[PDB]
């Protein structure tokens, strides 16, 4: 356009929009990993609970 500054800003904003959307995906993807960890930990403790009344 007739304004180089505006053109650069527009480009940077488009890039930011994408970077933000990507970080959103990254965060959401990490959620499944956190739940996986949390679930495996509960699984370990559950197993221990299942034998704690038998072994001390």
């Amino acid at each position: 356009s007739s304004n180089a500054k505006i053109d650069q800003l527009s480009s940077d904003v488009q890039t930011l929009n994408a970077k933000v959307d990507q970080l959103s995906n990254d965060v959401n993807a990490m959620r499944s990993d956190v739940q996986a960890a949390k679930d495996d930990a509960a699984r370990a403790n559950q197993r221990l609970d299942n034998m704690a009344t038998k072994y001390r």
Copy 2:
């Protein structure tokens, strides 16, 4: 204003500011979940340590 392009950029920047602030909350919230997982895992291993000198 007299510049439609600037108005659109301003709006997009305001939205980005909010989206970034939100992602910040999401990340911080996930921290408590990660620590919860990490703590429950250590708890399982601690329990195992407490009986490992008794059972092999």
Copy 3:
């Protein structure tokens, strides 16, 4: 510059670029913690597997 609005937008975009880059670091840093949790959980369950054929 001759446009206060553009100057403010430019500043805000620079700040956003930094905030986004930082969130990227925060997310990446959290990854090592999630893996740590996941690994310690697997470690607990592995230990349990190692004695499950001996104790029920």
